[PDB]
């Protein structure tokens, strides 16, 4: 159980490091400071969002009868934006290709 | 920059609630690129309404008052 | 009580060679019910929230962008 | 050109709203109607081209409304349909339990 609860902080926190660097380069692009409590927020919530992705992308691949989550799996996640679903549909073209 | 895949797997896994699922590389990439996309978005929606406030920071009630729209148009 | 074929018939317009099963426009009516459901919920708050007892296109429709987005696969 | 009744739908909206609603509105809900239907026509098209039918079957629709929100772990589809469902429909739903 504790062993979890580490992984768990492992990862928070890192996700945060990625979130604040992601966040660093919106901030340079437009040309404003974000607080420290934006991106611990933006990290948090984008946390959270991975708990959906995951019971979401779980459910998707059990559905096909299968364990291994594939990149139809991930498309079908994507395809409830249309914009979202072309741009990811995209980086798959460019990551099948090899 | 971007998500580390590694991070990215064991933060999926946390979540199943089936012990025996698992990902494979090629979605661990775009569930990165995805993951990407989010946040850089997060960001760019709330300095988007920071910088309609006339505010040099972008503060906390900005990504909650851009929030509820981000979830939605998002997954 | 449900015009079933009505359903089968929608679909089928939309998804021809799409064939259903069993009981499923059962399911699918339940959903569609739901939507109904949620559609109300929520446009009646936002005449509530407009200070007005009556529900008018304009609330109709916010609600529509919103449910209707909470509604896709 | 087929579609459920427009005072089907009116009639089921005005039941769960409870409010006087505008003509207009009813209007507009029964578009979105269309678009419901359409949408989700199009998702079973993929869930069931996913589990590799050419057939929708009920694991796909509850896939569905477990996606849309409606069946989650506090509020399971068996419920939804003891709710919701007219006993008729039901029945076939729920044999019993």
Redesign the interface.
């Known amino acids: 159980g504790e062993q979890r609860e580490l992984l768990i902080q492992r990862l928070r926190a890192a996700v945060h490091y990625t979130t604040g660097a992601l966040a660093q380069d919106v901030a340079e692009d437009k040309g404003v400071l974000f607080s420290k409590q934006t991106v611990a927020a933006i990290s948090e919530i984008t946390f959270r969002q991975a708990e959906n992705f995951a019971r979401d992308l779980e459910m998707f691949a059990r559905h096909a009868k299968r364990s291994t989550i594939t990149s139809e799996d991930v498309k079908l996640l994507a395809r409830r934006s249309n914009s979202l679903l072309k741009y990811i549909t995209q980086k798959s073209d460019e990551l099948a290709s090899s | 920059?971007?998500?580390?895949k590694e991070?990215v797997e064991?933060?999926?896994?946390?979540?199943?609630?089936?012990g025996?699922?698992?990902?494979?590389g090629?979605?661990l990439?775009?569930?990165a690129?995805?993951?990407?996309?989010?946040?850089?978005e997060?960001?760019?929606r709330?300095?988007?309404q920071?910088?309609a406030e006339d505010?040099?920071?972008?503060?906390?009630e900005?990504?909650?008052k851009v929030?509820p729209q981000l979830?939605?148009?998002?997954? | 009580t449900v015009p079933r074929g009505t359903l089968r018939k929608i679909i089928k317009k939309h998804k021809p060679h799409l064939r259903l099963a069993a009981n499923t426009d059962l399911l699918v009516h339940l959903s569609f019910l739901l939507f109904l459901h949620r559609l109300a919920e929520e446009a009646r708050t936002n005449a509530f929230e407009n200070k007005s007892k009556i529900i008018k296109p304009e609330h109709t429709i916010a609600a529509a962008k919103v449910i209707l987005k909470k509604s896709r696969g | 050109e087929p579609e459920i009744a427009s005072s089907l739908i009116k009639q089921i909206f005005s039941h769960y709203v409870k409010t006087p609603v505008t003509r207009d509105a009813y209007k507009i809900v029964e578009k979105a109607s269309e678009r419901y239907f359409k949408q989700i026509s199009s998702d079973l098209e993929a869930y069931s081209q996913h589990a590799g039918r050419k057939t929708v079957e009920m694991a796909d629709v509850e896939l569905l409304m477990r996606r849309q929100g409606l069946v989650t772990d506090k509020m399971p589809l068996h419920v939804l349909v003891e709710r919701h469902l007219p006993l008729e429909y039901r029945k076939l739903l729920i044999p019993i339990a």
């Open positions: 920059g971007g998500f580390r991070t064991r933060l999926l896994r946390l979540h199943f609630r089936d025996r699922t698992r990902v494979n090629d979605a990439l775009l569930m690129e995805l993951l990407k996309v989010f946040v850089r997060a960001a760019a709330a300095a988007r920071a910088q505010l040099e920071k972008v503060d906390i900005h990504v909650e929030l979830l939605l148009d998002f997954v």
